[PDB]
């Protein structure tokens, strides 16, 4: 039952590989083209298999793939890189349900993976966006069953509608039904409306309003 905690800041990719090799016991033949700096933040202690899933996520994020050439593992390249890889512990919600809601926040250059054995998320992004995503995970974690409504936007811009709907859930501009959540999927220009059933039905209509 060995649990490890990987914490790095601008550490060499080759040092991260040496640490993975120390944990896993697996020996890697690093290609010379494999170079760069990695930042890792472990909010959770991880199992060896969980550590291996982290390794793959870091490798995928920086443009490297693992090749098993005759029972011998080899890291080879693919075809902002000051990206952070965080291991976030989800407490009350099953991680798998959570990914559909978090994927819209992770960019194309980013990475998002589930570690169900540890009920944790591996996300690679910019540090400032990771802080935002963890604030989303925290808000989500509370609710029991994440039933949502999806609104595909025709005239409006998702990020405009999302900021508007969330700002309207306050004092100067009120919604009328709070405890609801807006998650913006830029890739498909759609809003994922969450929260209590009564609250969620109100927020849907407010997004429609803008679709005129």
């Amino acid at each position, epitope marked *: 039952e*060995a*649990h*490890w*905690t*990987i*914490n*790095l*800041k601008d*550490a060499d990719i080759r040092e991260f590989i040496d*640490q993975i090799s120390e944990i896993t016991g697996e020996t890697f033949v690093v290609d010379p083209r494999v170079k760069g700096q990695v930042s890792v*933040v*472990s*909010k959770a*202690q991880l199992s060896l298999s969980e550590v291996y899933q982290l390794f793959l996520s870091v490798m995928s994020t920086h443009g490297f793939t693992v090749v098993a050439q005759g029972d011998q593992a080899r890291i080879v390249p693919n075809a902002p890189d000051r990206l952070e890889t965080r291991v976030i512990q989800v407490q009350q919600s099953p991680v798998s349900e959570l990914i559909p809601l978090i994927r819209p926040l992770v960019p194309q250059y980013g990475h998002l993976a589930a570690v169900p054995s540890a009920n944790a998320l591996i996300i690679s992004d910019r540090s400032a966006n990771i802080a935002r995503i963890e604030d989303v995970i925290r808000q989500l974690d509370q609710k029991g069953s994440h039933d949502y409504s999806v609104i595909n936007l025709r005239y409006g811009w998702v990020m405009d509608a999302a900021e508007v709907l969330n700002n309207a859930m306050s004092r100067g501009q009120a919604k009328g039904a709070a405890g609801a959540q807006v998650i913006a999927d830029a890739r498909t220009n759609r809003l994922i409306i969450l929260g209590p059933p009564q609250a969620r039905a109100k927020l849907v209509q407010l997004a429609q309003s803008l679709d005129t």
Partner: nanobody, 125 residues
Framework: QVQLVESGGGSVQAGGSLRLSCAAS????????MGWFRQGPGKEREGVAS????????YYTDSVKGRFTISQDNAKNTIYLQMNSLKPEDTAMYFC??????????????????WGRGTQVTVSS
């Protein structure tokens, strides 16, 4: 070259509480983790809590989670262990150790470098 001093130990009844303290002498800038370990008579040395100094990231063993809380004060250069709902199993000589390694197993002493002397914690029936 960073010495560590422990205080806060004592004799308490079951369901009680103690606040253990661990003062660092030099600068924690060359040490990533500061953890708490305990040894019981006829029991092997085991880690209980650990904190990544730079970001204040806490780690706990299942047997201590939801009872104990590892905290820090970088200004006062001390790390704390707020021990609550204390069971008689918790009776042991508590040690506080520093780690100069970036990635370790936060509950295994081999990964740590400086160690303290200790504080006796006794929980009775």
């Amino acid at each position: 070259q960073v010495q560590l001093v422990e205080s806060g130990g004592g004799s308490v009844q079951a369901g009680g509480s103690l606040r253990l303290s661990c003062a660092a002498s030099g600068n924690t800038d060359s040490s990533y983790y500061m953890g708490w370990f305990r040894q019981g008579p006829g029991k092997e040395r085991e880690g209980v809590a650990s904190i990544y100094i730079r970001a204040g990231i806490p780690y706990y063993t299942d047997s201590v989670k939801g009872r104990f809380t590892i905290s820090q004060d970088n200004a006062k250069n001390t790390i704390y262990l707020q021990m609550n709902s204390l069971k008689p199993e918790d009776t042991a000589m508590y040690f506080c150790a520093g780690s100069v390694r970036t990635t370790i197993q936060p509950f295994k002493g081999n990964y740590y470098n400086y160690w303290g002397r200790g504080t006796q914690v006794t929980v009775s029936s």
